[PDB]
Design a protein around this ligand. Structure first.
Ligand SMILES: [Ca+2]
Ligand SMILES: [Ca+2]
Ligand SMILES: [Ca+2]
Ligand SMILES: [Ca+2]
Ligand SMILES: [Ca+2]
Ligand SMILES: [Ca+2]
Ligand SMILES: [Ca+2]
Ligand SMILES: [Mg+2]
Ligand SMILES: [Mg+2]
Ligand SMILES: [Mg+2]
Lengths: 46, 123, 129
């Protein structure tokens, strides 16, 4: 989740942004930095 | 030769800044850092590589504004059913471009949001 | 009147789908669900509200984004064409997913606002006829 402050200055973290928080497809992508891996994640995330 | 606080590359001078600013404030700030100053522009991959490396070497991992703004406002947005685009409900009004200091890929971010940045001018 | 499974709003028929497809696949899918079908076109606040309600009641997962029919009809990754220093944009190095030229509805904004997202993303959607 993006609080809308300076949180995006730091490296992405799946646990922090997608598990402890709800995340968008893009936030997950900033973690994997691979669109296909994010697509695979997305299928199992929703 | 570039100012002591700047870095030289192929006839231009570059300098990364850590002060968080939105796109507009960053661009404006750059114009005030030296004559002909602007947010950094990438005319080639070599130039981009130089800048990304400089940014990481100076501040480590972070995000830095590049000189591209309102990137999709002039695009041909159309409804698939050909309906006239009158009503608007954009969550964000404008997007700007930036790079994450770990690689030279171009990324997008709402122009109103904050980021660090890199200024550039021709020596 | 609308077919069973569809909902009526000011002369048109709407139907949400819990199927995950890219924008292109979803749009094509919609053209086959009804004569003149397409991804939903939000042309007024009231229609936006009607669609928002339809989504909330039919698309469970609040993590999903819902496709609408508005997108950049062109191949450009960006349409600025010029850097702030006045020079033309020739060289580019976008991550395709960062060129968010499609729009989706999402929970945080009550499924009423259009969020820029990657067109290659697989999301549920709403068709309109
Ligand atoms: Ca967060
Ligand atoms: Ca985040
Ligand atoms: Ca992130
Ligand atoms: Ca948190
Ligand atoms: Ca982000
Ligand atoms: Ca340049
Ligand atoms: Ca419509
Ligand atoms: Mg945890
Ligand atoms: Mg991103
Ligand atoms: Mg795969």
């Amino acid at each position: 989740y993006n609080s809308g402050k300076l949180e995006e200055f730091v490296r992405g973290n799946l646990e922090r942004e997608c598990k402890e928080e709800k995340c968008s497809f893009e936030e997950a992508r900033e973690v994997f930095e691979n669109t296909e891996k994010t697509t695979e994640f997305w299928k199992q995330y929703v | 030769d570039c100012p002591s606080d700047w870095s030289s590359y192929e006839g231009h001078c570059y300098k990364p800044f850590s002060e968080p600013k939105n796109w507009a404030d960053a661009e404006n700030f750059c114009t005030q850092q030296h004559a002909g100053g602007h947010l950094v522009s990438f005319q080639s991959s070599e130039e981009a590589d130089f800048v990304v490396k400089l940014a990481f070497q100076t501040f480590g991992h972070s995000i830095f504004w590049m000189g591209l703004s309102n990137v999709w406002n002039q695009c041909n947005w159309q409804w698939s059913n050909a309906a006239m685009l009158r009503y608007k409900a954009w969550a964000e009004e404008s997007y700007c471009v930036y790079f994450k200091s770990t690689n030279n890929k171009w990324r997008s971010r709402a122009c109103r949001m904050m980021a660090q940045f890199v200024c550039e001018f021709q020596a | 009147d609308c077919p069973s499974g569809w909902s009526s709003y000011e002369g048109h028929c709407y139907k949400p789908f819990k199927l995950y497809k890219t924008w292109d696949d979803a749009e094509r899918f919609c053209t086959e669900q009804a004569k003149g079908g397409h991804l939903v076109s939000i042309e007024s606040a009231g229609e936006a509200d009607f669609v928002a309600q339809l989504v909330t009641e039919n698309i469970q997962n609040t993590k999903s984004y819902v496709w609408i029919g508005l997108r950049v009809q062109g191949k450009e990754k960006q349409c600025s064409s010029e850097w702030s220093d006045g020079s033309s944009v020739s060289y580019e190095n976008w991550i395709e997913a960062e060129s968010k030229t499609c729009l989706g509805l999402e929970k945080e904004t009550g499924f009423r606002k259009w969020v820029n997202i990657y067109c290659g993303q697989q999301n549920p959607f709403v068709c309109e006829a």
